[PDB]
UniProtKB/Swiss-Prot annotation:
This is Protease 2A. Cysteine protease that cleaves viral polyprotein and specific host proteins. It is responsible for the autocatalytic cleavage between the P1 and P2 regions, which is the first cleavage occurring in the polyprotein. Also cleaves the host translation initiation factor EIF4G1, in order to shut down the capped cellular mRNA translation. Inhibits the host nucleus-cytoplasm protein and RNA trafficking by cleaving host members of the nuclear pores. Counteracts stress granule formation probably by antagonizing its assembly or promoting its dissassembly. It catalyses: Selective cleavage of Tyr-|-Gly bond in the picornavirus polyprotein. Zn(2+) 1 binds at residues 50, 52, 110, 112. Homodimer. The active site is at 15 (for protease 2a activity), 33 (for protease 2a activity), 104 (for protease 2a activity).
Amino acid sequence: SGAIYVGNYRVVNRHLATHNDWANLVWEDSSRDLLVSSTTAQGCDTIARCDCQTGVYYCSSRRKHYPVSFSKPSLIFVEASEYYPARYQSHLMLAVGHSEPGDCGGILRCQHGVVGIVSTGGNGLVGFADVRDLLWLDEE
Ligand SMILES: COc1cc(Br)c(CC(=O)N2CCC[C@H](C(N)=O)C2)cc1OC
Ligand SMILES: [Zn+2]
């Protein structure tokens, strides 16, 4: 679990969105595994606006933040799951890293701010949903 809190927005994995998230929906995209809802209180996270390919992510199944090198946002095949069928997840970045169902939500960040959230994983893999192209998170 986990979310990004920027301005009056809450960014979560679409597959983990609550009823309150759907009832206060701003935007959602199943191909990216992202959903944004509105919040009453202002958040403290800042979004990175950069092309970093190195950063650090939080892994709840290890209670640890790990430094990682990650690929550029791309269209990557994701294995069937209890959440989406075999499909191309878009705007996804991969890294070698520990991951477990439970971990989606964790923030990946660089020196500039939040880069994205844990969305997929593998045997020694973890995938990240990029948010750096969502410029509207910084306003309104
Ligand atoms: C350790 O191997 C895995 C780690 C993880 Br985390 C996972 C879970 C995983 O990737 N997804 C499940 C939740 C929806 C997500 C999506 N964005 O489509 C895809 C599987 C794994 O293998 C089988
Ligand atoms: Zn950066």
